[PDB]
Structure 1
């Protein structure tokens, strides 16, 4: 190939009875005609290919007032919609193209709306009726800096637009390009001008190469193609719908009449563009004709293909013309013909050219070695197609296109609750649709995660198969700094992490590393596999603190590593009791070794204390509980200040029963806690000095995150945090959690996540004040976690869904485009 071959990496279209590429394929393949009588709500030649309507547009989506929309050429409105759908089809998040060198090249040859406006003024009319802004408005909305132009070569406009885009890319003038065109038939005045010229079929059909050939039927619509160099496309890993090998445009020069096509100039166009691509008559599998069904122009076009691609070829060359389905879109005829060729190439199947029974007797199909495609066959030999588009004033263009070289979240977003619903519904319908079933739920989720703008109204549906996800969608259609609070003793439960281990590799890997180290530590000095204890439902070994502490630590670090791989990075950490060890380790204060030595030792040295220890949860202020226990310091103290009217009293089972009795006796909530010992009381004084010696043998570094102390109730700095005195005091004195929450809020935490099992700490954070428990109870752990990271994402946290799918080998696949909230905008 002479010059950089160019990649079609996406496309959009509104055409008669074909609102998008999928519908277009349906129509062509079914051999269906979208030509109808003029709809009654249009004005009046009594036949045409019309859009279901041209009056509706989501002005708000594109930051346009209802008055500006009303003054705006529906062509300008449609090409905005097509621009957005072209980029989404290609998988490019349009915000990533802001301030880049994206080119916009549009064929537009008709200003009907300007005709209506002027046959009957505010500041809006200038921009709304000026043709230049069919391209310029796309460029302004995407903030693109590439060249932005409208080209008028009559009925060849939209393919010349593609050419200028290919050349722009080849020269490095633009790095990506939107190219195509638009033609909306909305004024009678333009219908009468083409009628009086004599060119319209009285039957309202393009009898392309058929002998009934007597003129064209009008059509309306628009198309765009997303263009990158083939090089840049492959490199960036883009879906390649086909590749433009060569484009050319010439003019008839000295035609018989100004408006007669010249066989000579067509041959010259064809000889050049194919030679430039290096494609012999035999390598071309199909040609998408101009084929308007005119008496003069059909034979001349047949002739020209017969001279250049007829001679030098065994089999006849299949030809056809989308004008037989949707009519002559004029300015946007060429991009119509190209988008068909592209669908044929991706599907690897041909489709009928309608209105063909008896060949034109001025077109020897046998001699010229052309047969008209009349059947929806498959396409034999890669595959290569030519597209022709000719303007009445002589300027001809041809393009040569080749074929290309456990629990899942689906994320959906929109600019509006009503859009989010419509968005959710459109994905559900498509997921169940055949075309949606040629894509895996894995590929779909990854594509939703990486290839779609995250608009300000967002939902995550979860599910294990297509049916569960679709059902979740149908149901849907009906910040600050991120703070982590690490769960302590009480938050533990039999099974802890089994469901997460089977589900997420990243949890499993880290849970192995943490258990491997702990099995060695506890194997040496036991209170030998921590994993078996944790994952077994038939075991109460966890309620014993020499297992409880290491278990909470193992679950919490594995969980934190899973959250971290999802881009849920804590900026501030705190922990209730043993919670603090996980918090401190993931803040990088202790190596895994030292962390495991520390938590195991703590667990064991406390385990080997006698019974006679108890704790009770009490609905009472710190001030009340100080008054009640003052003088009993040696037997009992405050174990935790968890809320402003929530403290845990800890010590002698005797004196703890008494305190439970008192507060119950005052008609207050008093819940006896299931613990082996009186944690954070004088009963811990025996193991302290032994604990001090273990922490003395550990290396404490400065943390990578802000740590808030459960001892201090405040941001704790490294000099204090990296001392032996701190950790012994931590083991002994009251967990000032409620104060820790205030200190976190004080420092700018706006979102709180409980890292650990259940929601004990999440409740206490609610009491003190966006709070989410990473793994709430009475549901599968994967469910309750995805649910939790789902709220974070909806609340506005930038969860990295891309990195949820590094596990699977997920591939980008095409999706439904944005569900525009269209409303009527028009003159009066």
Structure 2
């Protein structure tokens, strides 16, 4: 190919009885006609291809006041809609194009709405009724700096728009291009002007190449293609819908009449454009005609396609015209023709040209070697199509297009709760439809995650099959710094991490690495496979602290690595007792080796202490409990200050039972905690000095995150944190968790996530103050985690959903476009 072939990487279209590409396929393939009488709500030649309506537009979506919407050419309104839908169609997130060199090239040859406005004034009229802003408004809304223009060559405007975009891309003037056109028939005055010309079929049909040929029927609509160089297309890994090899535009020059087309000029345009692409009469699979159905214009266009592509061909050449389905869209005729050919090329199937029975007696189809496509068939032999579009003032354009070279989240967002509902439902319908079933649930979710604006109102639905997700959608249609708090002893439960292991490789890999180290450490000095202990439901081994502490650490670090791989990065971390070892390690203070040495030792040295230990949760203030225990320092102390009326008392089971009895006798809650020992009491004094010797052998680095101490109840710096005195004291004195939550909030934490099993810490964080428990109980682990990272994403946290789909080899696929909240806007 001479010059850089251009990639159609997307498209949109509003056509008669075809609100999108899918519907346009249904219509064309069913061999259906959207030509009707003029709707009663239009003014009134009595025939035409009309949109279901031209008055409705989501002005708010594009930041347009109702009064500006009223004053705006519905052509401007529609092209905005089509622009957004073309980008979404291609997979590009429009915000990423802000300040890029995106070009806008639109064929517009009519200003009907300006006629309605003028035959009946505020600052709005100027921009609303001026044709230039059909392109310019697209450019202003996307914030694009590329060239932005409307072109008027009449009934060839929309294809010439495409040509100027291809050349624009070739010259590097623009990196991406929106091209096509728009034509709305919303004034009788233009209906009467084209009627008086003599161009209109009294029967209201384009009899394209048929012998009934007696004029064209009018149609209205718009189409846009998304254009990138083929090079840049493949590089950026974008859905390639088809490729423009060569575009050309000439003029009739010296025709018989101004309005008569010239056979010479059409041959000269064909010969040139094909030679630039290097395509012979035999390599062209199908030609999408102008084919207006005019007595004069049909034979000339036939004769010209004959001479160039009829000679040098054994088979007849298939020809058709979307003007037989939707009428003559004039300025938008060519982008209509191109968008058909592009669908015929992706589907690899031809569709019928309607209104053909007997051939025109001025068009020998046999001699010229062209056959009119009359049925939906498959397309034989890559596949190559040609598109013609001619203007009455003589300016012809042709384009040569070739075919292209366990638990899932679906994320949905909108600019409005009502849009989000509508967005959810539109995806359910599509997902559960034939066309959505050529796409896997995997592929869909990946496409939802990467290729779609995350608007201000967001939901996540989850499911294991399509039926489950579609069900969740239908149901849906009816911040600060991120703080992590790592769970302590009490939060453990048999099964811990089995369901997360089977589900997520990133958890399983990290869980295997942390268990591999721990199985060596514990295997050497046991209280030997920790995974088997944790994952077995028939086992109470985890209630024994020589297993509980390494188990909580293993589950918490796996979970942290899984969260981190989804972009859920804590900035500030705190831990309840053994929680702090997981927290401190992932803040990079201890290597995995030292962390495993530290936690396993702690587990063991405490495990080997005698019975006679107890802890009780008590509904009382710190000040109350200090008064009740003053003088008993040697037998009992405060194990935890968890809330302002939430402290755990720990020590001799004798004096604990007494304390539990006292607060119950005051009509307070008092729950006996299931634990082997009196943690954070004087009963820990025996193991302390042995614990101090294990930590004195470890290497403490400065943290990569802000650590808040469960001992200090405040932000803890490295010098304190990287000493032996801290970790012995940590093992012995009260967990100041309530105070830790305060210090986190004080330092700017707005979102709190419990990193551990259950929601013990989340409850205590709630009592102290946005709190979510990463893995709440009474539901499968994958469900409870996805739920939790869901709330975070909905509240505005930038979850990296892309990274959730590293496990699978998910491919981008076309999705429904934004469910516009259209409302009526019109003159009075």
Corresponding residue number in structure 1 for 2:584: 584
DSSP 3-state at the match of 1:756: strand
CA distance, structure 2, for counterparts of residue 251 and residue 575 of structure 1: 78
After superposition, the C-alpha distances for 1:86-127 in whole angstroms (9 at most, x for unaligned) are 000000000000000000000000000000000000000000
> Residue by residue, what CA displacement relative to the aligned partner does 1:534-566 show, whole Å, maximum 9, x if unpaired?
000000000000000000000000000000000
Give the match for residue 166 of structure 1. 166
Question: Within 2, Cα distance between the matches of 1:258 and 1:606?
Answer: 101
CA deviations 1:691-733 (Å, max 9, x no partner) are 0000000000000000000000000000000000000000000
Q: In the TM superposition, what is the alpha-carbon distance from 1:396 to its structure 2 partner?
A: 0.1
1:458 paired residue number: 458
In 2, Cα distance between the equivalents of 1:195 and 1:281?
Answer: 37
| Structure 1 residue 34 displacement after superposition | 0.2
Q: Work out the CA distance in 2 between the residues paired with 1:617 and 1:26.
A: 67
1:21 positional shift: 0.1
CA distance in 2, matches of 1:399, 1:627: 90
1:50 Cα deviation from its structure 2 partner: 0.1
> 1:528 & 1:300 partners in 2: Cα distance?
89
Following superposition, the deviation at residue 746 of structure 1 comes to: 0.1
- Match of 1:501, SS? helix
> How many angstroms apart in 2 are the aligned matches of 1:662 and 1:679?
21
Q: Which structure 2 residues correspond to residues 49-60 of structure 1 after superposition, within 5 A?
A: 49-60=49-60
| Residues in 2 aligned to 1:672 and 1:468: alpha-carbon distance in whole angstroms | 41
Pairwise CA distance, 1:154: 0.2
SS class of match (2:350):
coil
Q: Can you list the C-alpha shifts for 1:722-769, whole angstroms capped at 9, x where unaligned?
A: 000000000000000000000000000000000000000000000000
Shift of 1:272: 0.1
SS at match of 2:377: coil
- 1:183-226 deviation per Cα after TM superposition (whole angstroms, max 9, x unaligned): 00000000000000000000000000000000000000000000
The CA deviation at 1:577 is 0.3
In 2, the alpha carbon distance for the partners of 1:673 and 1:652 equals: 14
Per-residue deviation, residues 595-638 of structure 1 (Å, max 9, x unmatched): 00000000000000000000000000000000000000000000
In structure 1, distance between residues paired with 2:604 and 2:790: 38
| Alpha-carbon distance, 1:662 to partner | 0.1
Equivalents in 2 of 1:529, 1:613: separation in Å?
Answer: 28
1:362-397: CA deviation from partner (whole Å, max 9, x where unpaired): 000000000000000000010000000000000000
1:321 lines up with 2:321 in the alignment: yes
CA distance in 1, matches of 2:753, 2:256: 79
State the match for 2:597 in structure 1.
Answer: 597
Structure 1 residue matching 2:765: 3-state secondary structure: helix
Equivalences for residues 423-462 of structure 1 within 5 A: 423-462=423-462
- Which residues in structure 2 correspond to 1:216-231 (within 5 Å)? 216-231=216-231
Deviation, structure 1 residue 413: 0.0
Question: In 1, Cα distance between the equivalents of 2:427 and 2:627?
Answer: 62
C-alpha deviation, 1:15, in angstroms: 0.1
The alignment's TM-score, normalised by the length of structure 2, stands at 1.00
The answer as to 2:228 corresponding to 1:255 is no
Provide the secondary structure at the position in 2 that maps to 1:253: coil
Paired residue secondary structure (2:358): coil
Alignment-derived partner of residue 40 in structure 2: 40
The offset of 1:398, in angstroms, is 0.0
Map Cα deviations across residues 459-497 of structure 1 (whole Å, 9 max, x no partner). 000000000000000000001000000000000000000
CA shift at 1:242, angstroms?
0.1
Q: Deviations over 1:10-46 (max 9, x none)?
A: 0000000000000000000000000000000000100
In 2, Cα distance between the equivalents of 1:542 and 1:380?
A: 68
Moved >6 Å (runs of 4+): none
Runs of at least 5 residues in structure 2 that lack an aligned partner in the other structure: none
Task: Tell me the distance in 2 between the aligned counterparts of 1:197 and 1:39.
Answer: 23
Matches within 5 A, 1:395-794: 395-794=395-794
Q: Whole-Å Cα distance in 1 between the matches of residues 433 and 233 of structure 2?
A: 28
What root-mean-square deviation, in Å, do the aligned CA atoms of Structure 1 and Structure 2 show? 0.2
Pairwise CA distance, 1:325: 0.1
Aligned residues: 828
Q: CA deviation digits over 1:409-460, x for unaligned, max 9?
A: 0000000000000000000000011000000000000000000000000000
Q: Paired residue for 1:366?
A: 366
SS across alignment from 2:244: strand
Counterpart-to-counterpart distance in 2, 1:413 and 1:10: 21
Tell me how far 1:672 sits from its aligned partner.
0.2
State the Cα deviation string for residues 512-553 of structure 1 (Å, max 9, x = none): 000000000000000010000000000000000000000000
CA-CA distance at 1:170 after TM superposition:
0.1
Question: What is the deviation of 1:570?
Answer: 0.2
Counterpart secondary structure, 2:493: coil
Structure 2: how far apart are the matches of 1:268 and 1:448? 47
**CA shift at 1:770, angstroms?**
0.5
How far apart in 2 are the matches of 1:348 and 1:756? Answer: 53
Q: How far is the alpha carbon of 1:308 from its aligned partner? A: 0.2
Distance 1:827 1:673 in 2: 73
Deviations 1:286-311 (A, max 9, x none): 00000000000000000000000000
Residues of 2 paired with 1:500 and 1:19: CA distance? 44
How many Å separate the matches in 2 of 1:432 and 1:731?
A: 56
CA distance in 1, matches of 2:715, 2:552: 23
Cα deviation per residue 1:317-354 (whole Å; 9 max; x = unaligned)?
00000000000000000000000000000000000000
Structure 1 position 786, deviation (Å) = 0.0
- SS state of the match for residue 615, structure 2? strand
Structure 1 equivalent of residue 180 of structure 2: 180
* Structure-2 separation of matches of 1:646 and 1:718: 30
1:251 deviates by 0.1
Report deviation, 1:66.
0.1
Residues 772-814 of structure 1, C-alpha deviations (whole Å, 9 max, x = no match): 0000000000000000000000000000000000110011000
Tell me how far 1:80 sits from its aligned partner.
Answer: 0.1
Mapped to 2, the partners of 1:560 and 1:770 lie a distance apart of 19
How far apart are the structure 2 equivalents of 1:203 and 1:693?
Answer: 100
* Cα offset, 1:137, TM superposition: 0.1
String of CA shifts for 1:252-309, please: whole Å, max 9, x gaps: 0000000000000000000000000000000000000000000000000000000000
How far apart, in 1, do the equivalents of 2:492 and 2:436 lie? 42
Measured in 2, the distance between the counterparts of 1:107 and 1:807 equals 45
Counterpart CA distance in 2 for 1:716 and 1:525 is 31
Give the SS at the match of 1:154.
coil
Q: Distance in 2 between matches of 1:199 and 1:48?
A: 13
Q: Distance in 1 between matches of 2:349 and 2:696?
A: 75
Shift in Å, 1:821: 0.1
**What is the alpha-carbon distance in structure 2 between the residues aligned to residue 446 and residue 520 of structure 1?**
39
Secondary structure of residue in 2 paired with 1:662? helix
- Segments of structure 1 that go 5 or more residues without pairing to the other structure are none
Q: Helix, strand or coil: the match of 2:121?
A: coil
Provide the rounded CA distance (Å) in 1 between the counterparts of 2:783 and 2:156.
56
For 1:155, what is the secondary structure of its paired residue? coil
How far off its partner does 1:574 sit? 0.1
Please give the alpha-carbon distance, in whole angstroms, between the structure 1 residues aligned to 2:285 and 2:322: 17
Determine the C-alpha separation between the residues in 1 that align with 2:75 and 2:240.
27
Render the CA deviation track for 1:130-181: whole Å, top value 9, x for unaligned.
0000000000000000000000000000000000000000000000000000
Look up the SS of the partner of 1:10 in the other structure: strand
Does the residue aligned with 1:81 lie in a helix, a strand or coil? helix
The two structures have a TM-score, normalised by structure 1, of 1.00
- Match of 1:774, SS? strand
